[PDB]
mmCIF file of C-alpha atoms in Angstrom:
data_model
loop_
_atom_site.group_PDB
_atom_site.id
_atom_site.type_symbol
_atom_site.label_atom_id
_atom_site.label_comp_id
_atom_site.label_asym_id
_atom_site.label_seq_id
_atom_site.Cartn_x
_atom_site.Cartn_y
_atom_site.Cartn_z
ATOM 1 C CA UNK C 1 294.745 125.943 113.038
ATOM 2 C CA UNK C 2 292.095 129.101 111.445
ATOM 3 C CA UNK C 3 289.222 129.039 109.476
ATOM 4 C CA UNK C 4 285.383 128.856 108.909
ATOM 5 C CA UNK C 5 283.048 126.676 111.413
ATOM 6 C CA UNK C 6 280.410 124.714 109.368
ATOM 7 C CA UNK C 7 276.899 122.929 110.229
ATOM 8 C CA UNK C 8 276.347 119.225 109.664
ATOM 9 C CA UNK C 9 275.903 119.876 105.635
ATOM 10 C CA UNK C 10 279.331 121.439 105.473
ATOM 11 C CA UNK C 11 278.350 124.898 104.896
ATOM 12 C CA UNK C 12 279.760 128.566 106.166
ATOM 13 C CA UNK C 13 277.928 129.416 109.391
ATOM 14 C CA UNK C 14 277.116 133.131 108.698
ATOM 15 C CA UNK C 15 277.705 135.581 111.108
ATOM 16 C CA UNK C 16 275.589 138.577 112.091
ATOM 17 C CA UNK C 17 277.475 139.759 115.513
ATOM 18 C CA UNK C 18 281.104 139.353 116.546
ATOM 19 C CA UNK C 19 279.979 138.254 120.359
ATOM 20 C CA UNK C 20 277.949 135.370 118.487
ATOM 21 C CA UNK C 21 281.162 134.299 116.384
ATOM 22 C CA UNK C 22 283.106 134.770 120.112
ATOM 23 C CA UNK C 23 281.241 132.738 121.844
ATOM 24 C CA UNK C 24 280.698 130.148 119.172
ATOM 25 C CA UNK C 25 284.837 129.753 118.212
ATOM 26 C CA UNK C 26 285.582 129.392 121.927
ATOM 27 C CA UNK C 27 283.500 126.328 122.318
ATOM 28 C CA UNK C 28 285.156 124.859 119.262
ATOM 29 C CA UNK C 29 288.538 125.639 121.283
ATOM 30 C CA UNK C 30 289.456 128.696 119.164
ATOM 31 C CA UNK C 31 291.307 132.360 120.020
ATOM 32 C CA UNK C 32 290.148 134.533 117.365
ATOM 33 C CA UNK C 33 286.448 134.480 116.710
ATOM 34 C CA UNK C 34 284.536 137.047 114.700
ATOM 35 C CA UNK C 35 282.533 137.726 112.127
ATOM 36 C CA UNK C 36 283.831 138.709 108.626
ATOM 37 C CA UNK C 37 282.823 137.953 105.049
ATOM 38 C CA UNK C 38 279.074 137.197 106.976
ATOM 39 C CA UNK C 39 280.605 134.289 107.549
ATOM 40 C CA UNK C 40 281.955 133.109 111.471
ATOM 41 C CA UNK C 41 285.891 132.943 111.801
ATOM 42 C CA UNK C 42 287.321 131.127 114.599
ATOM 43 C CA UNK C 43 291.024 131.354 114.804
ATOM 44 C CA UNK C 44 293.325 129.027 117.278
ATOM 45 C CA UNK C 45 290.173 125.902 115.886
ATOM 46 C CA UNK C 46 291.140 122.014 116.131
ATOM 47 C CA UNK C 47 293.683 120.590 113.035
ATOM 48 C CA UNK C 48 290.542 118.594 112.804
ATOM 49 C CA UNK C 49 288.090 120.604 113.029
ATOM 50 C CA UNK C 50 284.888 121.146 110.623
ATOM 51 C CA UNK C 51 285.389 123.995 108.183
ATOM 52 C CA UNK C 52 285.809 125.623 104.960
ATOM 53 C CA UNK C 53 289.312 125.560 103.141
ATOM 54 C CA UNK C 54 288.459 128.213 100.628
ATOM 55 C CA UNK C 55 286.579 131.737 100.978
ATOM 56 C CA UNK C 56 284.464 131.364 97.848
ATOM 57 C CA UNK C 57 281.754 128.272 98.366
ATOM 58 C CA UNK C 58 278.763 128.042 97.716
ATOM 59 C CA UNK C 59 276.146 125.208 100.541
ATOM 60 C CA UNK C 60 273.468 123.788 98.215
#
């Protein structure tokens, strides 16, 4: 499944470069890892991956 990876708190991982997400996503078994909306997004994550199901979340 696709979505944005979150930290131990459940907040989307901010991304500043595509290469950064590419590697991260890959480690999470993802195929489309890139930086978008200032947030990392992987395509192909596991159905049990920890990501946010909303493009408009607020960590805090």
